[PDB]
């Protein structure tokens, strides 16, 4: 769901403004892939599976009995009195989805505004979804993949 992803993007911005060290997001494949990309890129300190009440200390298998109570817990980073994850916005919106070929993704990473999408800025992360997998735009260009431009994180 792009709506759920929009909710998570706004939630992370709200948490950064108040500078909470730990927060939770919905437990879904897309959310987990989204969070994992942020973790590998250094935007998130930690990524743990858990419940509504907090991160799990020991592995708890997820089943239909507890799926409704599952959450993903992420740790936010702050350095030099500044949040590492300052902004998080969707590019492809629920009511206007944007699919780009690899050629247009290369233009976006080169400073060209494609379909009103402002080009990639220094130190910014743009994520792309292709065949239900989320990857960095630079990685999609390396794999010659065409996909939906989901969001941009800075």
């Amino acid at each position: 769901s792009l709506v759920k992803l929009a909710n998570t993007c706004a939630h992370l911005q709200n948490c950064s403004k108040v500078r909470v060290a730990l927060t939770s997001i919905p437990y879904t494949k897309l959310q987990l892939q989204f969070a994992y990309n942020l973790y590998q890129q250094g935007f998130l300190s930690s990524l743990q599976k858990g419940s509504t009440m907090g991160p799990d200390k020991d592995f708890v298998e997820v089943t239909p009995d507890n799926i409704s109570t599952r959450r993903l817990w992420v740790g936010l980073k702050y350095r030099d009195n500044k949040p590492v994850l300052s902004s998080c916005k969707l590019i492809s919106k629920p009511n206007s989805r944007i699919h780009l070929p690899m050629e247009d993704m290369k233009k976006l990473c080169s400073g060209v505004t494609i379909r009103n999408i402002k080009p990639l800025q220094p130190g910014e992360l743009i994520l792309v979804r292709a065949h239900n997998n989320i990857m960095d735009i630079n990685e999609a260009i390396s794999k010659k993949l065409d996909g939906e431009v989901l969001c941009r994180v800075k």
Binding site: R19, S24, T52, M53, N66, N81
Partner: protein, 237 residues
């Protein structure tokens, strides 16, 4: 109030003054602050345990952990509404510290109201010097009071001499009565023995109270008379 930035970055703002040349001379604090960086995260931190009672914070009991029926005779097969509400706020709210001794302390002073009348000094001397062996109630350095009973009760339950808290508490209470009776006699006898050897005392406690009551009853006499004369005039109207 907004998280301030300029108080913790004095070193970085100063460094720009020196590099540009706006400030010719390095301040004396400059080197000290550089070697000892200020903390500048100002984040809210989660907590997963109450330090007082060791209760775990942030743990959800899954339905798989409640296989048996409840007090109503029903099994739990699905999460309830409370289980489905995010509880992040509990991770950040300062835990309420609780102690079993607090319950006993309230009981002791409910059973012995006049123990409250014995003045207590809250000013600490040195908490780290307290070397107490609670096998006995009396201790060198601290008064005999309700706390002596509570600590004795805990030692009994900690050593497992008694199982029920009530039994340990009752045992400690009797030890407290014995010590209180020996002191009430030492004071009575000491006064009696001194008077028998020619000790003289200016004012007794009973006398002190009479004098203080006289001072108050004298002002009260004047006002009563004054207010019983204004009434007579005002009522005459």
């Amino acid at each position: 109030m907004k998280i301030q930035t300029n108080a913790v970055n004095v070193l970085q703002r100063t460094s720009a003054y020196l590099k540009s040349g706006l400030l010719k001379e390095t301040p004396a604090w400059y080197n000290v602050v550089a070697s000892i960086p200020p903390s500048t995260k100002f984040t809210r931190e989660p907590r997963f345990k109450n330090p007082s009672n060791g209760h775990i914070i942030g743990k959800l009991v899954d339905v798989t952990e409640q296989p048996h029926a409840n007090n109503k005779g029903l099994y739990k097969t699905r999460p309830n509404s409370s289980d489905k509400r995010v509880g992040v706020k509990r991770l950040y709210r300062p835990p309420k510290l609780t102690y079993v001794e607090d319950r006993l302390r309230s009981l002791f002073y409910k059973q012995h109201p006049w123990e409250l009348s014995r003045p207590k000094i809250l000013v600490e001397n040195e908490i780290g010097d307290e070397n107490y062996d609670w096998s006995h109630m009396l201790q060198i350095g601290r008064p005999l009071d309700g706390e002596s009973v509570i600590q004795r009760t805990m030692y009994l339950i900690k050593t497992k001499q008694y199982g029920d808290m009530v039994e340990a508490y009752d045992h400690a209470r009797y030890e407290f009565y014995a010590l209180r009776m020996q002191e009430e006699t030492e004071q009575q006898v000491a006064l009696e023995e001194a008077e028998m050897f020619g000790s003289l005392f200016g004012v007794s406690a009973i006398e002190h109270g009479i004098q203080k009551e006289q001072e108050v009853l004298d002002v009260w006499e004047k006002k009563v008379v004054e207010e019983t004369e204004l009434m007579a005039a005002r009522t005459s109207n």
